[PDB]
């Protein structure tokens, strides 16, 4: 085994980085960009889709977690399979499934079918990170592999910014009407299609063929690589003098057995320690990162809510008689008023409350109302015509000889206003995504100088320390700075992981092990999101404690990992 890895390292090491490597880099960054775009869609869609699709808060949470659940399943499935059927074929299958289901999700009406489409889209896109990294790792040599793999992490943020830009450039046009959020979904379903388009032109890497006793295809693929790189470097005189490489329903059951064997061989005596260290590291890092990255926007929203409450204005003791009104009201309280023989026509209300009021012989007609209530109010001989007033809008009131006529149809569930303040979401996500650029650059430049282990541990401990500064920012302005700081100072820890997991497992098990670890990452992400979403407003010590302890565990386990810098990839 090890002898082949020496010979394999020798072939590509001579042809050197060149045309073929950059071509594969771009055509694989397309798949990574597709993943980055996919993980943002449902988030930029909930505020607008919550009206058409009549979405409760429970449905919002389930939709928020469906992408991560699908990504977990897809990572495990496609990683397990790719070690048998190849990397190119499996990536094509998974990306095509993602594109198909993500396109169908745009022309879908019901909530359950939308959830199913999004889950299958996540299953399709789960296997991009493992297959892409493992597959590109087999066209690189050890002198600079770490930097080469680290520049491949840049396309994920490119996809994030693409999704944010399209969301900003499509969703706010609320007057189009099929509204604009479906168009945003369809437009964001494109990079996967381009990924299949650009992936069909690339050979299946020769390492898989060699590991599968298919040295002929390995030789022809290596010949393509050499020919392309030499044609690039303007040295057609050179000849590929390298000789042949060293030689070493039932179908579904056989594939399942082979995948199970690959997975079970990861816990063998050689790889038990490494595998357990990696399980702990991936779990802890994912838990902390996802918990914080979803806790920050929630805190911004809650702090804005407190400001909104502090901006309310109260109107006590108003008496109105024989007056008509058609003027929109917002963020107001009206207490202890009396309205006799009043007509309210074309009235729009938002976050308006009425307490201890009295209505007698009044007349409502065509009233819209969000977060509007009637507490301890009395109605006598009042008529409600074509109104948005539901049963739950009357809290502790009593109505005598009133009437509801032409009751306006629509979603009964409230908090479903077409337009919510989602602009802040787009800009916050855009800044958070840009925060990873300096981290990506420094990590890519210094991975092969500092080393995988040292960079991983340093970034992890720095993030653990930076978490303590959470309490130092209590304003909406400080939370953005903290979000950019945590995101940009922790991204290196992720890159060092992707390079470190790739270089630590045998070529026959690299995709299986990486897929299992990414599935564990997505599971930990789900758990972290769930736990941390219950801390907003409660306090500020709990998130600090949880995310500092988890990153401490991660750094402790990370420091006990082998080193892979300057070692041949086996």
């Amino acid at each position, epitope marked *: 085994r090890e002898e082949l890895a020496q010979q394999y390292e020798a072939i590509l090491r001579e042809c050197g980085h060149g045309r073929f490597q950059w071509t594969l880099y771009f055509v694989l960054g397309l798949a990574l960009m597709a993943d980055g775009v996919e993980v943002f869609v449902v988030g930029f869609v909930l505020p607008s889709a919550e009206k058409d699709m009549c979405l409760s808060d429970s449905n919002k949470g389930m939709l928020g977690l469906i992408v991560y659940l699908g990504m977990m399943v897809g990572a495990f499935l496609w990683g397990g399979l790719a070690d048998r059927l190849g990397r190119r074929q499996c990536l094509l299958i998974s990306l095509s499934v993602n594109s198909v289901f993500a396109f169908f999700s745009s022309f879908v009406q019901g909530y359950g079918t939308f959830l199913f489409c999004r889950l299958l889209s996540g299953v399709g896109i789960g296997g991009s990170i493992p297959i892409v990294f493992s597959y590109f790792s087999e066209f690189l040599a050890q002198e600079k592999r770490g930097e080469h793999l680290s520049w491949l992490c840049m396309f994920w943020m490119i996809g994030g910014v693409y999704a944010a830009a399209m969301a900003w450039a499509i969703i706010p046009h609320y007057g189009w009407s099929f509204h604009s959020w479906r168009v945003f979904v369809l437009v964001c379903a494109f990079p996967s299609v381009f990924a299949i388009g650009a992936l069909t032109t690339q050979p299946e890497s020769p390492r898989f063929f060699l590991e599968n006793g298919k040295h002929d295809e390995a030789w022809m693929v290596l010949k393509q690589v050499h020919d392309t790189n030499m044609r690039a470097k303007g040295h057609p005189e050179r000849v590929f003098s390298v000789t042949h490489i060293k030689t070493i329903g039932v179908r579904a059951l056989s594939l399942g057995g082979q995948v199970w064997g690959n997975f079970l061989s990861c816990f063998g005596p050689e790889y038990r320690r490494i595998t357990l260290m990696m399980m702990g590291v991936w779990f802890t890092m994912s838990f902390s990162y996802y918990g914080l990255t979803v806790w920050f926007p929630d805190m911004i929203r809650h702090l804005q809510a407190v400001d909104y409450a502090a901006r309310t204005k109260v109107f006590p003791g108003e008496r109105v008689e024989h007056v008509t009104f058609n003027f929109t009201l917002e963020n107001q309280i009206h207490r202890g008023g009396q309205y006799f023989n009043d007509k309210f026509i074309g009235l729009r209300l938002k976050s308006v409350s009425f307490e201890d009021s009295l209505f007698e012989e009044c007349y409502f007609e065509d009233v819209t109302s969000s977060n509007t209530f009637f507490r301890n109010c009395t109605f006598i001989n009042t008529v409600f015509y074509n109104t948005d007033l539901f049963e739950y809008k009357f809290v502790n009131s009593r*109505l005598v000889n009133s009437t509801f006529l032409h009751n306006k149809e629509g979603c009964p569930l409230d908090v479903t206003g077409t337009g919510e303040g989602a602009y802040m979401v787009y800009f916050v996500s855009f800044l958070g995504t840009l925060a990873v650029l300096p981290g990506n650059i420094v990590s890519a430049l210094l991975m092969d100088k500092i080393g995988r282990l040292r960079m991983l541990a340093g970034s992890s401990v720095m993030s653990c320390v930076s978490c303590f500064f959470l309490s130092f920012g209590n304003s909406e302005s400080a939370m953005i700075a903290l979000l950019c700081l945590f995101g940009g100072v922790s991204i290196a820890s992720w890159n060092a992981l992707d390079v470190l997991t790739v270089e630590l497992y045998p070529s026959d098990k690299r995709t299986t092990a990486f897929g299992f670890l990414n599935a564990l990452c997505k599971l930990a992400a789900v758990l972290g999101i769930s736990i941390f979403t219950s801390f907003v407003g409660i306090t500020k010590a709990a998130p600090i404690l949880f995310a500092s302890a988890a990153l401490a565990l991660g750094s402790s386990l990370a420091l006990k990992l082998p080193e892979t810098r300057g070692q041949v990839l086996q």
Partner: nanobody
Amino acid sequence: QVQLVESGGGLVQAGGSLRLSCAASGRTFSRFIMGWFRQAPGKEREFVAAVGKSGDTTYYADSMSGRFAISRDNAKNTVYLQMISLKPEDTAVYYCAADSSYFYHTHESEYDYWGQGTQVTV
């Protein structure tokens, strides 16, 4: 299908007081507006009162408030109609019904289920 059963009727002396209890046996009881109707001899079922989905707000028909008090207990899974100062006019069969909607309704058609009935004689 929620089954509603009424009780507490009978003959009552004029100017007295009486209470009608409507028991429901379905875990899903708090998702309906509970309406009390009455049917007099020769007339139709006329809406009397209704109580919302959380026991906060009531909805009284015309000429009823002052003699009818409607409430609901969500722990005992029941609805209550208290009547007082009963006159000879208030002789009828009282029915209990459920509406699953999000608007208060006085039309008998809009109510989903219906109770058996009780008799009140003055």
